[PDB]
């Protein structure tokens, strides 16, 4: 059970069935997906991205480690991704607003997470706030790890969907906007736990009532699960 793609090996682990690499793939997952989103929505210019292979089928622009700014943003997502190791990360989302730092978003690219108790089969419960089941829970809990190649296809689906939404579906962003990364901790995460680069906040983000959405794709490595969605006012 391994991903034998020659290109895949550079950015990703060849094996995603064990806890460490399952969590590590997620970190690499966050990095690639949000790189494509930032690039294809033209939040950042080309010069912050390095052309990379995901598979022999698909290329992608990933945040450049050799540019000052893009390296900071890559580091930011790497910290968020590392929190996946102990099940401390509920959600990371690229949040676009009119002004820094509005609560209600114009557009949001969200990755939402779920962790599994042991063997990577039974899902750890993820709740409100009020005790209510999380919106992204059911869909991800029903899933079963189907091998490394299934995960490879999921990563390809996500990046291709990201490219599709920005190229064919989404209206352009305004001349003036502010885009920042906002995350949510799991309840399991202790008070002593904080993710570098992210300020503590009592507020997250909100969406207008008339918000439209689209599913970018899901991820099911051996011991983790994620769903990526696009929320925006600029569809069609």
């Amino acid at each position: 059970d391994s991903i034998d793609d020659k290109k895949w090996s550079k950015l990703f682990p060849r094996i995603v069935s064990d806890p460490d690499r399952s969590s590590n793939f997620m970190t690499r997952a966050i990095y690639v997906a949000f790189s494509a989103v930032l690039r294809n929505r033209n939040i950042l210019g080309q010069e912050y991205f390095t052309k990379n292979y995901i598979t022999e089928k698909l290329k992608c622009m990933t945040l450049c480690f050799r540019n000052l700014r893009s390296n900071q943003i890559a580091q930011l997502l790497r910290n968020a991704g590392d929190a996946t190791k102990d099940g401390f990360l509920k959600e990371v989302s690229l949040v676009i607003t009119n002004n820094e730092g509005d609560l209600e978003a114009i557009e949001v690219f969200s990755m939402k997470f779920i962790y599994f108790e042991n063997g990577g089969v039974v899902a750890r419960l993820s709740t409100d706030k009020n005790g209510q089941e999380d919106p992204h829970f059911a869909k991800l809990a029903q899933l079963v790890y189907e091998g490394g190649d299934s995960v490879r296809d999921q990563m390809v689906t996500i990046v291709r969907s990201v490219q599709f939404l920005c190229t064919k579906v989404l209206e352009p962003l305004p001349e003036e906007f502010t885009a920042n990364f906002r995350l949510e901790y799991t309840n399991d995460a202790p008070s002593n736990f904080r993710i570098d680069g992210f300020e503590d906040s009592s507020t997250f983000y909100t969406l207008p009532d008339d918000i439209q959405s689209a599913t970018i794709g899901h991820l099911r490595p051996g011991c983790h699960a994620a769903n990526m969605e696009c929320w925006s006012m600029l569809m069609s």
């Binding site: 001349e175 885009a179 906002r182 949510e184 008070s191 904080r194 680069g197 503590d200 997250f204």
Partner: peptide
């Protein structure tokens, strides 16, 4: 130290 469930990063502004 942290009594809040949310994290905010510095952003990119155009």
């Amino acid at each position: 130290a942290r009594d809040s469930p949310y994290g905010l990063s510095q952003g990119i502004t155009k």
